[PDB]
């Protein structure tokens, strides 16, 4: 007994294990499990495709299972790994099925990089795999019956997901196997094995002929359909077409006598003598015709005995009228069979190699709301800064809170004794001298470990040029120039790096440099400093004068304003939101992650409560700055301009700036330090990525 | 600020 099968397609055996280690290894922390993992699940996945792919051999479901657990997993990998997105250069070869191809060949080929196509012909080969085991069946046995059964709906189901996924993911033209109008055709003829299947069961069971007959019928509309498909295309193995049509002949004769024994069983005798003849015809044309591809002999045999008896029983006794096949109602048809749908995993106890590793979708987000983060925070940090810098610069060159403190001309003002106590406990003048004197030779470290490095680059290469020169043949290897251009381009960029640093020391140096003088002044005992600051006969309505008071109050004001700035920037930086989770939730219950609406939503969760704040700073500060200035040209009126007090007057104004300075520069110094000091961790790692790369060649 | 951005 013969049923169609499809053969297996073959596959050039490709790198799966590196590219893939690749992409891991420049994601997470080399050293580290989340490193560790995800190599020994990718090389047993490379393992697993030749398994599966690489032989076409085994016949049975040891290895089909193996090919199913091939497609599972091959799925489950998609949403990791950017293949979607293209720079992974895995390109996958098959050749087609059948040696068709829509030009005059004798095969075709298709290699592309794209996992879609990879999983299309997987899938074929599942499909093609549970064909050949099912047409292996033995059909007078039950586990026969429902072994083919079940692999022929499976198949069926296979090429039909493989009809509405082809176009879609691989992005070319496919091979004529895998191409949609074939695999609809493929899918449809297993359907119809499937009925063929069951048709044979349910007489196997003694069934009543009257569901025989229509499940016989079913399977001849399935096997009429896929023969007309094929009529106008030649795309199937040469064999397909005679035996599709051989077996829509059988189905009709099996159908029409079937539903001979019921005529029967009613007392129509011209109709049981009208369709055992066509019975009759169908076989004995498919017995002469198709002789190669079936045997029909015992069938016949069986129609003719019921013919002959019929018409002795319908001549001598009944006399029935027989007629035309045209005035016979329709025999019914009655399908039990159905394409299974593929959703993974197929495989029996499936297992994800990858299921930890965290998808691509969340990635670029988790990522991409960093950098919102990131100006949103900055953007409220820098604001600040700029304002507080901007207030401080018209307090001092209006001579406030000093002014309004300034008792008589005798002492130094509460404000400026506060200000100097605060710099002296500091470290005074040796903090700022000290971090000045040291930021060149952190500076002088960090251009050591960028030219070492690069020389370690410039000594390899040399010899290695000295040596391909020498030994033309016995040295054949990429020049080490090829091999060395990345690292020398992170090199140029550390390089540029560098440049602006020293301008920025050029900076602070400059500021530091027009200020030491005023600030080592600031930083003398209390007695010492009041002798260096000019006495001056003070302007005496400044007892209850109500401008003072309002002055008073309004730099109260503006002091708790900027005092707060400070705990709102820490409270800006020392919060944040773990953001996977929210991005997680919203893959697995929508299409796609949208994470512009999604981080909007919550940076204004999080963040909103301070950047509101952040702005009721700078509007309030606007307003104090405002009524100020102009309150404070009205007590310039109860001060008059002579010698004594306008010099007392520059020296207050410059002793505040020089507060501000030292403020400013010790914040700016310790900013170099820092970043001379990380820039150190970054050009280590860099000296040692040179010398592995100059000892592994 | 003033010194330039370490990021990668």
């Known amino acids: 007994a013969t049923f169609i099968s499809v053969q297996l397609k073959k596959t050039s055996e490709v790198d799966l294990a590196k590219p893939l280690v690749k992409f891991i290894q420049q994601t997470y922390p080399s050293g580290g499990e989340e490193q560790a993992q995800y190599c020994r699940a990718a090389e047993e996945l490379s393992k697993l495709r030749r398994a599966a792919v690489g032989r076409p051999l085994d016949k049975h479901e040891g290895a089909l299972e193996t090919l199913l657990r091939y497609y599972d997993q091959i799925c489950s990998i998609e949403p990791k790994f950017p293949f979607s997105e293209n720079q992974i250069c895995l390109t996958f070869t098959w050749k087609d099925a059948f040696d068709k191809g829509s030009l005059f060949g004798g095969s075709v080929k298709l290699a592309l990089a794209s996992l879609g196509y990879e999983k299309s012909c997987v899938l074929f080969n599942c499909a093609a795999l549970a064909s050949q085991i099912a047409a292996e069946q033995n059909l007078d046995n039950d586990e026969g019956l429902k072994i083919a059964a079940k692999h022929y709906q499976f198949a069926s189901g296979a090429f039909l997901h493989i009809k509405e996924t082809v176009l879609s993911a691989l992005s070319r033209e496919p091979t004529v196997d895998i191409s949609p109008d074939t695999v609809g055709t493929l899918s449809l003829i297993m359907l119809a094995q499937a009925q063929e299947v069951f048709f044979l069961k349910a007489t196997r069971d003694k069934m009543k002929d009257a569901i025989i007959a229509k499940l016989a019928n079913q399977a001849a509309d399935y096997f009429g359909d896929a023969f007309k498909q094929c009529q106008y295309k030649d795309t199937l193995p040469k064999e397909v077409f005679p035996v599709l049509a051989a077996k829509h002949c059988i189905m009709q004769a099996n159908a029409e006598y079937h539903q001979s024994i019921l005529a029967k069983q009613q007392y129509y005798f011209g109709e049981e003598i009208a369709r055992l003849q066509h019975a009759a015809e169908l076989i004995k044309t498919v017995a002469s015709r198709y002789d190669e591809y079936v045997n029909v002999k015992d069938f016949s045999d069986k129609i003719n005995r019921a013919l002959a008896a019929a018409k002795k029983d319908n001549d001598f006794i009944y006399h029935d009228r027989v007629p035309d096949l045209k005035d016979l109602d329709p025999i019914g048809k009655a399908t039990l069979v159905k394409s299974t749908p593929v959703n993974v995993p197929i495989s029996q106890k499936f297992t994800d190699l990858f299921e930890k590793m965290v998808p691509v979708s969340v990635q670029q987000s988790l990522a991409a709301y960093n950098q919102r983060k990131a100006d949103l925070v900055n953007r409220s940090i820098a604001q600040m800064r700029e304002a507080t810098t901007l207030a401080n610069g018209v307090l001092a060159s209006l001579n406030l809170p000093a002014a309004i403190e300034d008792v008589s001309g005798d002492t130094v003002p509460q404000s400026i004794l506060t200000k100097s106590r605060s710099v002296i406990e500091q470290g005074g003048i040796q903090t700022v001298d000290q971090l000045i004197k040291e930021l060149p030779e952190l500076l002088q470290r960090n251009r050591e470990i960028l030219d070492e490095s690069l020389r370690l680059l410039d000594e390899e290469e040399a010899t290695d040029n000295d040596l391909r020169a020498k030994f033309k043949e016995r040295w054949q290897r990429t020049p080490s120039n090829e091999l060395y251009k990345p690292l020398r381009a992170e090199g140029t960029n550390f390089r540029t790096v560098l440049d602006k640093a020293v301008q920025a020391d050029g900076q602070v140096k400059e500021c530091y440099q027009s200020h030491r003088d005023t600030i080592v002044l600031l930083c003398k005992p209390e007695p010492e400093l009041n002798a260096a600051i000019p006495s001056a006969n003070p302007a005496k309505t400044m007892q209850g004068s109500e401008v003072v008071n309002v002055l008073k109050s309004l730099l109260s004001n503006l002091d ?125 790692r860099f000296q040692n990525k040179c010398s592995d790369i100059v000892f592994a060649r | 600020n003033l010194y330039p951005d370490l990021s990668e």
Do not use: C, P, W
């Open chain 1, 560 to 684: 708790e304003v900027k005092k707060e700035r400070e705990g709102l920037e820490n409270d800006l930086k020392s919060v944040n939101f773990d953001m996977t989770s929210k991005f997680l939730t919203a893959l697995a219950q929508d299409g796609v992650i949208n994470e512009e609406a999604l981080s909007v939503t919550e940076l204004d969760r999080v963040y909103g409560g301070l950047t509101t704040k952040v702005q009721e700073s700078l509007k309030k500060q606007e307003g104090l700055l405002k009524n100020i200035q102009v309150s404070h040209q009205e007590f310039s009126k109860m001060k008059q301009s002579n010698n004594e007090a306008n010099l007392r007057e520059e020296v207050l104004k410059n002793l505040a700036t020089a507060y501000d300075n030292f403020v400013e520069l010790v914040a700016n110094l310790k900013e170099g330090t820092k970043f001379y000091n990380e820039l150190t961790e970054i050009l280590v």
